Amino acid sequence: NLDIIGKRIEKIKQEHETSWHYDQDHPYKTWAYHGSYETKQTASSMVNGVVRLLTKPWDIIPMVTQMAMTFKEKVDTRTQEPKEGTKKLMKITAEWLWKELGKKKTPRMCTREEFTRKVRSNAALGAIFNKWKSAREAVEDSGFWELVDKERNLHLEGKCETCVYNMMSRAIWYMWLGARFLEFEALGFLNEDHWFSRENSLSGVEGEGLHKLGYILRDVSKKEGGAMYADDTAGWDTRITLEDLKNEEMVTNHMEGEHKKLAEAIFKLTYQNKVVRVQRPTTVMDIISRRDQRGSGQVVTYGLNTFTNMEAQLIRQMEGEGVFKSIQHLTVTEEIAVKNWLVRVGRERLSRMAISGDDCVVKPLDDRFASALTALNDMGKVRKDIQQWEPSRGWNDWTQVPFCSHHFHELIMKDGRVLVVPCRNQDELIGRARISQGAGWSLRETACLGKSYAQMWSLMYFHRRDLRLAANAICSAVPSHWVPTSRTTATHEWMTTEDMLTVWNRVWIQENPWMEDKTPVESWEEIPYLGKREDQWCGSLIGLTSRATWAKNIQTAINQVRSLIGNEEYTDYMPSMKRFRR
């Protein structure tokens, strides 16, 4: 408790010594509360006018238009201590999993140089504004690095002064850039060196890309076994136990020297003990603490979520296969049985999964998995939207399984070759492309964000009639040479000024390990669509009068946007489609 967080608390006390008051009407039950101080401040979603002017039919679709308008009673909940048998299963599994992940990788520190390059090309490193304006400026000033050094030597001493979270089914815990650096220095290797790649982790998909996820799910479907299970957890980040955080910390067992000590300090001082500042309108700033739940940088959160989800799903698989009888207590011979299962079939069982942070798809040996719930519930990974003890419903067809907010279609090209393509309800895609985040967007910056969405649609969603047409229209409306942008950045092959047909060929043909015939596609007309009825099922407006008028008059919409942007160099991409090809 207060020996580890006291220093951080003491320091904040003094910078607001004219405001410190131990409030009596504090709303916290599961968070430890320490005091309050005076503040007064808040970033809503803005519409992208380039995308909206080129998607007129969707102006009257509420699922699209409502997306642009507008649980902290789940962050304030508590998770019970797992039973001794559960804790044993998790420790054995975690020990075995870090060794497997470490077989072909070497833990290492990430560098000021690496951190500096990241910031100088905009990655969402959840930092705060003070002394320097942006992250870009702090990184060039040697005063910052002297602050970093003071904290670093403090961490080596087993103490913390400035690693404090700022709070803001979503919850993002910003820290000052210095704290983020020290986290990246110790644990950045997990992401930077691809520990959760599919080649390295067998269950993972880190770096895989939306054009690969469908092929990965189809490969899992080819295994002998039961239904495909895709159970979502109710608020995964809030269900991370102190036992989970202790099994995650065992990655430090694979480290040495300085690194081992720096990593151990991040786990002890920032993850297993946390200090947070929250805005309350009653507007004061609350300084609260707790030991458990997830609150790291988003990128370390992704890797440790993937790790602990892989662990939980192997244990649920063990339960279905009858490897252990009860979570109350593992016998001595059950421990040897669990260890022996992992050595004998662990890697095979990992290959039966696709795991992306809190999101999973499992194809178990058989459907006993469906009612194997005791370990999963006792670890605190309670399933969303189903009663605690009600057996999971599995999917009989890999094309119906939800994963990473998508489903996947099998699409046969006129030439016989097989594409496995990502899909989701088209209102979601159009509604997201119509939204920007943040202030001070020029017309040129807004146009370049529209072009980023258009090129993503050309590469990932070319099989949706409305998106291929809207992508061609946006790319026709934005100057040919303007570079696509995004203020918050998997593999983003659409972020380029290269011709999108050349990029399509590289991604779907040349570099696609599931495509044996490498014959390049010569035109967009060789590239197929979903069936017309399937396109409507997934939200297409094909068949509506609104959509027919839009498609027929598209050059008028394109001209409207060109007239606003001004006298620039434009390309007509519409004749890449049959119906505009005269």
Ligand X SMILES: CC(=O)NCc1cn[nH]c1
List of residues contacting ligand X (CB under 6 A): 559, 562-563, 566-567
Question: Which C-beta is closer to ligand X: that of 336 or that of 564?
Answer: 564
Question: Which C-beta is closer to ligand X: that of 545 or that of 567?
Answer: 567
Provide the minimum distance between the beta carbon of 443 and ligand X in the complex, in angstroms, as a whole number: 13
To the question of whether residue 463 is assigned a binding role by annotation, the answer is: no
Using CB under 5 A as the binding rule, whether residue 429 contacts Zn ion is answered as no
Provide the minimum distance between the beta carbon of 567 and ligand X in the complex, in angstroms, as a whole number: 4
To the question of whether residue 359 is assigned a binding role by annotation, the answer is: yes
User: Of Zn ion, ligand X, none, which one does residue 559 interact with (CB within 5 to 8 Å by kind)?
Assistant: ligand X
How many Å separate Cα 458 from the centre of its chain? 22
To the question of whether residue 404 is assigned a binding role by annotation, the answer is: no
Between CA 510 and CA 519, with CA 513 as vertex, the angle to 5 degrees is 35
To the question of whether residue 385 is assigned a binding role by annotation, the answer is: no
Spatial neighbors of 439 by CB under 8 A, at least 6 apart, are 46
User: Of ligand X, Zn ion, none, which one does residue 563 interact with (CB within 5 to 8 Å by kind)?
Assistant: ligand X
Place of tokens 């003890």: 389
Q: How far apart are the first and last CA of the chain?
A: 74
Nearest residue to 286 (alpha-carbon basis) of 17, 16, 542, 33: 33
User: Of Zn ion, ligand X, none, which one does residue 567 interact with (CB within 5 to 8 Å by kind)?
Assistant: ligand X
Provide the minimum distance between the beta carbon of 497 and ligand X in the complex, in angstroms, as a whole number: 20
No. of helices (H) and no. of strands (E), the chain = 23, 10
To the question of whether residue 487 is assigned a binding role by annotation, the answer is: no
Question: Which C-beta is closer to Zn ion: that of 423 or that of 527?
Answer: 423
Question: Which C-beta is closer to Zn ion: that of 344 or that of 532?
Answer: 532
Between CA 369 and CA 374, with CA 372 as vertex, the angle to 5 degrees is 155
Give pairs for 193-199: CB < 8 Å, separation 24+. Answer: 193/105, 193/106, 193/108, 195/101, 195/105, 195/303, 196/302, 196/303, 196/306, 196/307
Using CB under 5 A as the binding rule, whether residue 175 contacts Zn ion is answered as no
User: Of Zn ion, ligand X, none, which one does residue 353 interact with (CB within 5 to 8 Å by kind)?
Assistant: none
To the question of whether residue 34 is assigned a binding role by annotation, the answer is: no
Question: Which C-beta is closer to ligand X: that of 323 or that of 475?
Answer: 475
Question: Which C-beta is closer to ligand X: that of 194 or that of 562?
Answer: 562
Burial (CB count <10 Å: 0-12, 13-18, 19+), residue 543: exposed
Q: Tell me the CA distances in angstroms from 229 to 371, 422, 555, one per residue in order.
A: 11, 19, 46
Using CB under 5 A, pick the residue from 323, 423, 449, 527 that binds Zn ion.
423
Nearest residue to 8 (alpha-carbon basis) of 156, 164, 175: 164
User: Of ligand X, Zn ion, none, which one does residue 160 interact with (CB within 5 to 8 Å by kind)?
Assistant: Zn ion
Using CB under 5 A as the binding rule, whether residue 433 contacts Zn ion is answered as no
Provide the minimum distance between the beta carbon of 555 and ligand X in the complex, in angstroms, as a whole number: 9
Provide the minimum distance between the beta carbon of 566 and ligand X in the complex, in angstroms, as a whole number: 5
- Judged by phi (left if over 0) then psi (alpha if -120 to 50, else beta), residue 435 lies in beta
To the question of whether residue 151 is assigned a binding role by annotation, the answer is: yes
To the question of whether residue 35 is assigned a binding role by annotation, the answer is: no
User: Of Zn ion, ligand X, none, which one does residue 262 interact with (CB within 5 to 8 Å by kind)?
Assistant: none
> CA-to-CA distance for 193 and 24, rounded, in angstroms?
48
Nearest residue to 449 (alpha-carbon basis) of 474, 422, 427: 474
Question: Which C-beta is closer to ligand X: that of 80 or that of 567?
Answer: 567
Question: Which C-beta is closer to ligand X: that of 53 or that of 263?
Answer: 53
- Neighbour count for residue 567 (Cβ, 10 Å): 7
Using CB under 5 A as the binding rule, whether residue 163 contacts Zn ion is answered as yes
To the question of whether residue 409 is assigned a binding role by annotation, the answer is: yes
> CA-to-CA distance for 545 and 547, rounded, in angstroms?
5
Using CB under 5 A as the binding rule, whether residue 467 contacts Zn ion is answered as no
Provide the minimum distance between the beta carbon of 562 and ligand X in the complex, in angstroms, as a whole number: 4
**Which alpha helices (DSSP H) does 379-442 contain, by range?**
426-433
User: Of ligand X, Zn ion, none, which one does residue 566 interact with (CB within 5 to 8 Å by kind)?
Assistant: ligand X
> CA-to-CA distance for 252 and 460, rounded, in angstroms?
39
Provide the minimum distance between the beta carbon of 244 and ligand X in the complex, in angstroms, as a whole number: 58
User: Of ligand X, Zn ion, none, which one does residue 538 interact with (CB within 5 to 8 Å by kind)?
Assistant: Zn ion
Q: Tell me the CA distances in angstroms from 389 to 371, 372, 377, 392, 406, one per residue in order.
A: 8, 9, 9, 9, 27
User: Of Zn ion, ligand X, none, which one does residue 163 interact with (CB within 5 to 8 Å by kind)?
Assistant: Zn ion
Q: Which residues pair with 47 in a beta bridge?
A: 435
Place of tokens 């930092």: 127
Q: Which one-letter amino acid corresponds to residue 101?
A: L
Provide the minimum distance between the beta carbon of 160 and Zn ion in the complex, in angstroms, as a whole number: 3
Question: Which C-beta is closer to ligand X: that of 28 or that of 570?
Answer: 570
Q: Which one-letter amino acid corresponds to residue 24?
A: Q
Q: What are phi and psi of 395, to 5 degrees?
A: -105, 135
To the question of whether residue 550 is assigned a binding role by annotation, the answer is: no
Using CB under 5 A as the binding rule, whether residue 275 contacts Zn ion is answered as no
Provide the minimum distance between the beta carbon of 180 and Zn ion in the complex, in angstroms, as a whole number: 11
To the question of whether residue 358 is assigned a binding role by annotation, the answer is: yes
Using CB under 5 A as the binding rule, whether residue 538 contacts Zn ion is answered as yes
Question: Which C-beta is closer to Zn ion: that of 160 or that of 190?
Answer: 160
Helix (H) or strand (E) holding 420: strand 418-423
Helix (H) or strand (E) holding 345: helix 332-350
Binding residues for Zn(2+): 151, 155, 160, 163, 407, 409, 423, 538
Binding residues for CTP: 170, 235-237, 305, 384
Binding residues for Mg(2+): 232-233, 358-359
Please report, as ranges, the residues that interact with Zn ion according to CB under 5 A. 151, 160, 163, 423, 538
Binding residues: 151, 155, 160, 163, 170, 232-233, 235-237, 305, 358-359, 384, 407, 409, 423, 538
